[PDB]
Subunit: 487 residues, 4 copies
C-alpha cells in the first residue's frame, strides 16, 4: 500500500522525524506498508493541535457531541467488512473473527458512551443555609492512548470513546506491529464531524513515540494496554516527567476453575474459547485450567477432540478459525516458552511446533498446544505466553484451587464452571481478579467495567465509571455568609 | 522529655529491628521532643504480614460493625481534642489556637463522615438479556500505605486512614520524620475503639528508607502520599517499578486568589490574609498569588499591611497567639532563600522578609510575615511554591488576562475569586484550572467535598463519597445462564 | 378538512367499537379539522392486551436495540419538524413561530436524551456477609397510561412516552380531546422507527369516558397526568379506589417572579413578558405573579406597556406572528371572567382586557394580552391560575416579605428571581417553595433537568435521569448461601 | 391499667381536646392495658403547626448534627431494648423471644443506617453550555405523616420516621389503635436524644377520624401508610381529593414460596415454617402459598407436620415460647372465617384449624397453627390474605406453570424459591412479579434493601438509599449567565 503518514488536525501529514518502519503481513512475511514514525516535534505538534480541537469540542453541547460519535458508529457499521479485512492483513486474525468481533464490539462501546454524555453530572452539597458546594466533572484536556497489537481498532475505540465522550482530545499511538486501522478510524471520525485535533494518530516506535507522549507536560492522562513489563516502564516515566493520571490494562495468567459437578462438554468448550481464540493472543485468556483429578483424563480427551476441529488456513476463508501469530519475533518468544514446558517435565498433550506445508511455511504459525501434568512452579504456568498454549492443572479440593488460582502476581480475569448456586458465587467472591465469568468466557459488554487486580492493571475500561475517570472533579464552594479572619 | 517512641504493629508498641533512631525537635525551642525508632525493611515486612491478617478480620465484619468501631474512635478523638492538639503544637510549631480548633476537629469530622457511609458502599447489577446478567463487587484493595506530611500530621493521618479503613482495608501509615508523635497516639485510639489488631499500623522512619520500603513492597495494593511535588515524582515512580500500585497524591500548589474590580477590599484583604498566613504559610492550598486590579492595588496593599501588623506571634499556648514558627530550621533556610530571590529579582518588599529576633524567638525557626508587591509572572517567588508566610501581589488589567495568568502554571491545586456578582463569580471559577475553588472565602474543606489537584498538583482526590470508592476495586461478574456456544 | 381519525392499537389504525365520535376544531377559524373516534371501555381493554403483548417483546430486546429504535424515531421527528408543527398550529392555535422552534424540537430532545440512557439503567449489589448478598433489578412496570393536555400536545406525548418506553414499558396514550391529531402522527412515527406493535397505542376520547376507563383498568400499573389542578384530584382518586397505581401529576401553578432592587429593569421586563405571554399565556409554569420593588414599580409598568404594544397577533403561519388565540371559546370565557373579577376587585387595568375584534379575529377565541397592577394577595386574579394572557404586578418592600408572599400559596410549580447579585440570587431561590427555579431567565426546560411541582402543583417529576428510574420498579433479591436456620 | 395515655405534641404529653378515648387490650388475657385519648381535628392542626416550627429548626442544623441526634436515639433504643420489647409483647401478643430479638433491634438498625447517610444526601449539577448550568437540591418535603399498622408497631414507626427525619422533615405519626403504646415511648426517646420539639409528634386515634384528619390536612406534604389493601385504597383516595400528597403504601400480600424439584425438602420445610408462623402468621411478607412438586408433596406434608408439632405456645415471657395469640379478638374471628371457608371449599386440613383451649389459653385470642393442603388457585384461602397462621400447600408439575400461577394475583409483595441450582434460582426469580425475593431463605429485610410491593401490594418502597431520597423533593435551579432573549 501507500506509505502511511501521521494524522494531525484532521489531515494526513508527513512525520518530522525522517524515520519510518514496516508492518509485516504475518500470513506471508511480505511488507504491508511503510509507516512514518512520529518524533518529539510530531508529538508537540499533535498536542498543540489537540489543545485547539479540545476547546471546540468541549464548547459544544453534550448532545452535539453525542450525535457526532453516533455518526461515527454508523460509518463503522457500514464499513465493518472493509475494516475487518485490513485488520486481518495486519494482525493475522481470521476474517471470521475480525468481521464479527473487532469492529462490532469497538463500535458498541463508542455507541454506549455516545448515549451517556448527557448523563455526565456533578453534585451539589448543602453545608448550611449560607454556603453550599457544587462539583463540575471537567475534561482532563489532552489525553494519550497507547494501544496493543492484538485488537488494534477495538482498543482504539475502547480508549477514544470514553475520552472523547468526556470532552477530551485524544492522541492515539497504535502498536508499531499493527498501525493501519487506527488511521482509518481517524478518517472516519473526521467524516462524522469530529473537530480537527480531537483524535490525532501518531504511529511510531514505543521506545520513541510512546516515551515522548508519556513525557509531554501538557498531556494530562495516559492510557496504556500491553504486557506487564512494558507497562512498568510507561508508568514510571508518566511520573518522573509530569504528574499524569494513568490507566493500564496489562497481561494476566487467568485461571479457569472447573468444579466437580461441571459438565465436561461445557467445560471443554469454555476452555477452548478461553485459550485458542485469536490464536491465543488475548490478555484475558484462561491459560491455567484447573480440573478435578477425578475428571482429568476425560477432560483431556474432550480437549483433544475439540483441538482436532481447529481449522487453520486461508484467513479470508469462511471456515478458517485459527490464524498465525502477529509476527515472527513473537512466535520465537512463544516457541521458547513451549520448549521450557517440555524441558520442565510438563506432558505435551498436543501441538508444540510450528505448522508446515503449502501456505504455512511463509506464515508465523504455531500449532494449538496443550500441556498437562503441570505444576505451579513451571515457567509456562507462572508467566504470560500470549500464544495458543493451554496449561492443564489437576486439583483435589476447593480451598486448594482457590489458593493456587490466587497465588500469582497477575490478576486480570478468572472463571468458574459449575451448575451449583452456592459454589459459583462463593468461589468467585474469593478470586482476586477484576473480570469473572460464570459458565462462560470472554464476553465483555460495554456496560461492564474491566481491568486487573495486582500487577495486571491500574484502573478500568468500559462501564459508566470509565466515562467518569476521563473527567476530573472541580469542587466549588459558594460562601454567602460573612467571612471571618482571625488576623 | 517523652519516652523513646516505638513502632506500632499489630495492636501494640514494638521495638524496631533497624537499630536506627531519629529525633523530633520542638520548633519553638530547638529542644529534642523525643527519640523515635525507625522502621527497617524487616519491620515493614512484619507490618504487612500483620496488616494482611487484620484486614481479613476487619473485612469479614458487617458494614455496621465497622461503622460503630470508627464512631467510637471519633468519640475518643473528640474527648481528647485538647490533649492531641497540645501535642501537635509541640511537634509542629503551630499555635494551639489553630490545632485545637482545626487539626483534630476536621480530622475527626472526616472519620465520622466515612463511618456513616460504610453501609452505602454498593456495587451494580446490569441485565444483559433474559439469560445473562452482570453484577459488581466493590472489594477492598487489601493493604494500603499512607505517607503523611508534616504540616497537618494528625489531620492527614485521619484523612488517609478513614476512607481506607471504611472501605475495608488495613493501612500502614508512615508519618513525616519531622512530626511522628500524633500518628502513634492515633494508633492507640483506634485500638481502644476496637479496631482489630493489624488494621492500622504506624511506622516512623525516613523517606529514603521506611517510605521507600513501603512503596516497593509487593503486597501493598495502593499508596497515598501527601508532600511536595518533587517528592511525589519519586514516590510515584517506585510504586510502578516494583509492583503496579494504585496511587493517590496530594502535592503542592501556587494557587491564585483573584480579586475582582467590584470586590469589597476589606473582604478581599481578610481572605488574602487567611489564604497566606494561616499555619505560618505552611499549607498546600494557600493563595500565594494574589491578583488585584491595577486601580485598587495601592489601596489593597494598605489594607494588607494594616492586617499584617495585627499578626500576633508569641507563646504557642497563649490564647491570642495566631502565628507560629516554621516547622524546622532547614525549612526556614529554604524559605529565606526564596525571600532573598524576591529581593534580588526586583520585587518590592512591603513587610517582613527576615527572621524574628529577641527573647522567645532566637531559639525558634521564626520568619516574619512577608509581602511582596510589583511581582511579575517570571519571578521565582511567583512561579514556585515556598511553603512559608510569603504573599505575592500581582496587578492586572482585565478578566481574560487574569484567567490566562492564573492558569499559566504547572500547579493546579486551589483557586478563588472575590466578587459579589453572580455571573462573574461562576464564569471566572469555571475557567480556572484547579480542583478546589472558593468563592468569597478560603480554606474550608468539608468532609463531603472532594479535594485534590489538577496537573502537577496531584493524582486522585481525598474526601467526598468518591474517595471511599477509590479505596475499593471493582470486580465484574457475569452470570451466563444460557448455553455456551464454542466456535471450535 | 381531513379524513376521519381512528384509534391506533397494535401498529395499525382501527375503528372504535364505542360508536362515538367527536370533532376537533381549528381555534383560529372555528372550522372542523377532523372527526375523531372516541375509545370505549372495550377499546381500552383491547389496547391493554395489545400493550401487554408488545411490552414483552420490547422488554426482551437488548438495551441498545431499544436505544437504536427510539433514535430512529428521533431522526424522523427532526425530518418532519415543520409538517408536525404546522399540524400542531392548526389543532392548538399556537403560532408556527412557536411550534416549529419549540414543540417538536424539545419533545424529540427528551426522546433522544432517554434513548441514550437505556444502557445505563442499573440495579445495585449489596454485600451482607460472606455467605449472603443482595442485588436489585430495575424492572419495567408493564403497561402505563399517559393522559395528555392540550397546550403542548406532542411535546407532552413525547415527555411521557420517552421515559416510559426507554424504561421497557408499553404506554397507552390518551391525548386531549381538544388536540388529538399529533399524537396519532407520533404513533405512526414510532412504528416506522421499528417500535414493536402494541408498545405505543393512542386512544382519543373524552376525559369523562376514555380517561376514566384508563385510570380504572386493573392491568395498568401507572398513570401519568398533565392538566389542571382540579382535574388532577379526580384522576388520582380513581387510580387508588379501583386498582393501586403509581401516579405522576403535572398540574398548574401561580408561579412568582421576583425582581430585586439591583435588577436591570429592561431584563426584568423581558423575562416577565416571556413568563406571561408565550403560547398566549397557556403555560403551566408561567410567572403570573410579578413582584417588583415599590420604588421601581412605576418605571417597570412603563416598560411592560412598551413591550405589550409589540405583541403581534395575526396569521398563525406568518413568521412575525408571536401571539395566538386561546384554544377554545369556553376557555376564553373563563379568562374573561377572571379579567372582569380583576376590574371589580379594584386591580388597576394597565392594558388589554378585551376580546380582539375585526376581520381575522372574529372567528377565533382571541383575548388581548392583559396586565393588572396595584394587585393584592387576596384578589382572585392573584390567587388562582388563569391559564391566559393575564399578568399581575405586585409591589413589595423587603426581601423577607416577598419570600413569604411568594410562598403563601397552595401552588408550587415554578419560581424565578432577577438579580445580578451572587448572594441574593441563591439566598432567595433556596427559600422558594417551587420545583423549577430560574435565575435571570424563564421557561427553559432541558431534558436533563427534573421538573415538577411542590404542594398542590404535582406529584413526582418529569425529565432527568430520575424520571427514567421512576418508570421502573425495584425488585430486591437476596441470595442466601449459608444454611437457613428455623426456630421451629 | 396504666394511666390514661395522652397525645405527644411539641416535645411533651398533652391532653386531646376531642373528648374521645379508646382502649387497647392485652390479647393474651383480655385485660385493658390502658385508656388512650384520640386526636381530634383541632389536635391534628395543632400538631401540624408544631411540626412546621420544629422542621425549620431541624433542617437548619448541619447534616452531621442531625446524624448525631439520630445516633443518640439509636443508643437509647439499644439500652432500653428489653423494657420496650416487654411492652410490645403486652400490646401485640408477640412472644418476647421475638420482640426482644427483632422488633426494636431491626427498627434501630434502620434508624442507625439512615443516621449515617444524612451527609451523603446530595443534589446534582449539570452544565448546559458555557453560559448556563443547572443544579438540584434535595429539599425536605416539610411535614409528613406516617400511619402505622399493628403487627410490628415500633419497628414500623422507626422504618417510617428514620428516613423522614434523616431527610430533614418532621413526622406526625399515628399508631394503630390496636397497638398505640410503644409509639408514645418512641417519642420521648427521640426528645431525650435531642430531637427538636415538633419534629416527631404522635397522635393516637382511630382510622376513620384521626387517620382521616391527617390525610385531609392541606399542610402535610406526604403520607406513608402500612396496612391492608382495602384501607390503603381509601387512604390514597382522600390524600388526593383534599390535598395532592406524595404517597407511600406497604400493603398486604399473598406471596408464593416455590420449592424446586431439586430442593432439599428439610430446608424447604424450614423455610416454609418461618415464612408462615413467625409472629403467628401476622406478617405482610409471609409465603402463604407454598408450591411443591407433585412427586414430593406427600413427603413435604409429613415434614411440615413434624415441625408444626414443635411449635411451642405458652407464656409469652417464657424463653421457650415461640408462638403467640393473634393481636385482638376481632382479628381472630376474621381468621376463623377464612379457616371455615377453606373447609367448606374442600381444602384438606393437615393440622390445626381451631382455637387453643385450656388453662392459660381460654382467655387469649389464640389460633392453632393451621396448614391446608390439596389447595387450588381459586380457593378463598389461596386468593385472599388471611394475616393469620394458615399455610396453603399447592401441588405443581412444571416450572413454566408454577411461574404463571405464582404471578396470577393482584398481590405483589414477596416471593421466594428453594433450589440449589444457579440457573434455576435466578431464572425463576427474574420472572416473578414481586418486589422482595428470597433465594433459599425467607424474611430477612436488611436496612440497605428496598422493600415494597408490585401491583396492589403497594406504592413506593421502604429502606435502602432510595427511601431517604423519596422523603425529599427535587428543586431544579437554572443559573443563566448569558443575555436573556425575549421574542417580544
Amino acid at each position: 500500500m501507500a506509505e502511511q503518514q501521521l494524522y494531525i488536525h484532521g489531515k494526513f501529514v508527513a512525520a518530522t522525524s525522517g524515520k519510518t518502519f514496516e508492518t509485516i503481513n504475518p500470513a506471508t512475511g511480505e511488507v504491508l506498508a511503510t509507516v512514518q514514525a512520529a518524533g518529539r516535534e510530531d508529538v508537540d505538534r499533535a498536542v498543540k493541535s489537540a489543545q485547539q480541537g479540545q476547546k471546540v469540542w468541549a464548547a459544544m453541547s453534550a448532545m452535539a457531541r453525542s450525535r457526532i460519535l453516533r455518526k461515527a458508529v454508523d460509518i463503522l457499521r457500514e464499513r465493518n467488512d472493509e475494516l475487518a479485512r485490513l485488520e486481518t492483513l495486519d494482525t493475522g486474525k481470521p476474517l471470521s473473527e475480525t468481521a464479527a468481533v473487532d469492529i462490532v464490539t469497538g463500535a458498541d462501546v463508542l455507541e454506549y458512551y455516545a448515549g451517556l454524555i448527557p448523563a455526565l453530572e456533578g453534585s451539589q452539597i448543602p453545608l448550611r443555609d449560607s454556603s453550599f458546594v457544587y462539583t463540575r466533572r471537567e475534561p482532563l484536556g489532552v489525553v494519550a492512548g497507547i494501544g496493543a497489537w492484538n485488537y488494534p481498532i477495538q482498543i482504539a475505540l475502547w480508549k477514544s470513546a470514553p475520552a472523547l465522550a468526556a470532552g477530551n482530545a485524544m492522541i492515539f499511538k497504535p502498536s508499531e506491529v499493527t498501525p493501519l486501522t487506527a488511521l482509518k478510524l481517524a478518517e472516519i471520525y473526521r467524516e462524522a464531524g469530529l473537530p480537527d485535533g480531537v483524535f490525532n494518530v501518531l504511529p511510531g516506535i514505543g521506545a520513541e513515540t510512546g516515551q515522548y507522549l508519556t513525557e509531554h507536560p501538557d498531556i494530562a492522562k495516559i492510557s496504556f494496554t500491553g504486557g506487564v513489563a512494558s507497562g512498568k516502564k510507561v508508568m514510571a516515566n508518566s511520573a518522573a516527567s509530569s504528574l499524569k493520571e494513568v490507566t493500564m490494562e496489562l497481561g494476566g495468567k487467568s485461571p479457569l476453575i472447573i468444579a466437580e459437578d461441571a459438565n465436561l462438554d461445557l467445560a471443554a468448550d469454555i476452555a477452548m474459547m478461553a485459550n485458542f481464540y485469536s490464536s491465543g493472543q488475548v490478555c484475558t485468556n484462561g491459560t491455567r485450567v484447573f480440573v478435578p483429578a477425578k475428571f482429568k483424563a476425560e477432560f483431556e480427551h474432550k480437549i483433544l477432540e475439540r483441538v482436532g476441529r481447529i481449522r487453520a488456513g486461508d484467513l479470508f476463508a469462511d471456515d478458517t478459525n485459527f490464524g498465525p501469530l502477529v509476527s515472527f519475533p513473537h512466535r520465537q518468544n512463544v516457541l521458547r516458552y513451549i520448549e521450557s514446558g517440555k524441558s520442565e517435565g510438563a506432558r505435551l498433550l498436543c501441538g508444540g511446533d510450528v505448522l508446515k506445508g503449502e501456505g504455512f511455511d511463509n506464515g508465523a504459525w504455531v500449532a494449538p498446544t496443550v500441556f498437562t501434568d503441570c505444576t505451579d512452579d513451571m515457567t509456562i504456568v507462572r508467566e504470560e505466553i500470549f500464544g495458543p498454549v493451554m496449561s492443564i492443572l489437576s486439583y483435589d479440593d476447593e480451598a486448594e484451587v482457590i489458593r493456587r488460582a490466587n497465588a500469582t502476581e497477575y490478576g486480570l480475569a478468572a472463571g468458574v464452571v459449575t451448575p451449583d448456586l452456592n459454589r459459583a458465587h462463593r468461589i468467585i467472591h474469593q478470586l482476586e481478579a477484576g473480570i469473572c465469568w460464570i459458565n462462560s468466557w470472554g464476553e465483555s459488554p460495554a456496560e461492564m467495567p474491566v481491568g486487573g487486580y495486582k500487577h495486571s492493571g491500574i484502573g478500568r475500561e468500559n462501564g459508566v465509571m470509565t466515562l467518569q475517570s476521563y473527567t476530573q472533579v472541580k469542587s466549588i464552594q459558594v460562601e454567602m455568609g460573612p467571612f471571618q479572619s482571625i488576623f
